[PDB]
């Protein structure tokens, strides 16, 4: 019937295919500007930013908004091509390119997850009248998060030992 | 004759070498313990704070911080084993691990560069008036960051394209 090797691999084509609306329509609203988004969009992302306390997208620090800048520049256009490559399967092309995202994307998340778990976010920080004050809340954060690093690192594991992508 | 292939594996290797010295004397002294470095050590960095009013290894961030416990963990065990590889020559074992190493050390530097380069060190922020102001001091800071984000880029697109390692 179904392996398991492609079952993953249908995981992975809907992690993708999912990034890109997520990316375009969440994500690059602190880099890009706001007249491209409609007034409905505006307020969808201020609504999750008041849900969950997100400190980072609402005011994006230098470092924070470097990263937004990898994900349109190199990410947003290898999503489409990493989707089309898990769905129909046997593409071995995708190999190295796949560990590349893998490992970029890990990274990216590191400071990220550190960040929201230790920083303090009430005055005397640059972050002002925004981010999660209670250990709860920081988790329901980290939790929104975490699936792009563990799903980037399952696939850096998957790409390096498949003899079928080597 | 030599070769650029053969003298770039030569230059990788004293480059993976010297990087032993300079994490564990300089880079992580944000992170270990101070009472770890004899007293000329200490202010051996003090004076590089100093003269090149760098804003991030004295009194590191919190995402700055997450990096230098990836420098201690990940990459300084494997400096050695890169060094040796490169040395040698012709190791086709170390083209993944070393495509891990470069995309990860490229990753962590596109923030490092971009707040050293854009960000705000005035004395009303919260850097606290330790950082360059000029452009021609923030250049003096990126110009010994900059390194270590042009060689991993060397080494990326090395072990991608060289026969001799696939
Ligand atoms: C034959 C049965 C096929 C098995 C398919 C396995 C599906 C794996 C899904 C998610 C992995 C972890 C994601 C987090
Ligand atoms: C490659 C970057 C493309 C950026 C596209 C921004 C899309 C935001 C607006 C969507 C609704 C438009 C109606
Ligand atoms: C299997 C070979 C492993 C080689 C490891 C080289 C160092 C990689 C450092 C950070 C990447 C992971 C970031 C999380
Ligand atoms: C800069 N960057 C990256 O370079 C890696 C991917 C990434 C991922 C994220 C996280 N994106 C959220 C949490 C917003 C997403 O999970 C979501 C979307 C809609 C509803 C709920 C949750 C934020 C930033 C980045
Ligand atoms: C976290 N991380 C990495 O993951 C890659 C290597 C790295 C490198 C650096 C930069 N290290 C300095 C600037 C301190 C070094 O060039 C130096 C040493 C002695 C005298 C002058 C300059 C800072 C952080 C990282």
Redesign the pocket.
Known sequence: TLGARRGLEWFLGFYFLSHIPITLLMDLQGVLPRDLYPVELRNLQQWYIEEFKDPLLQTPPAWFKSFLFCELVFQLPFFPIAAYAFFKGGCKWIRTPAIIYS?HT??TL?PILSTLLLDDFSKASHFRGQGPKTFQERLFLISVYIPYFLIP?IL?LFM?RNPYYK
Do not use: D, E, H, S
């Open positions: 490992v890990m990274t590191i690192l850096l390096v």
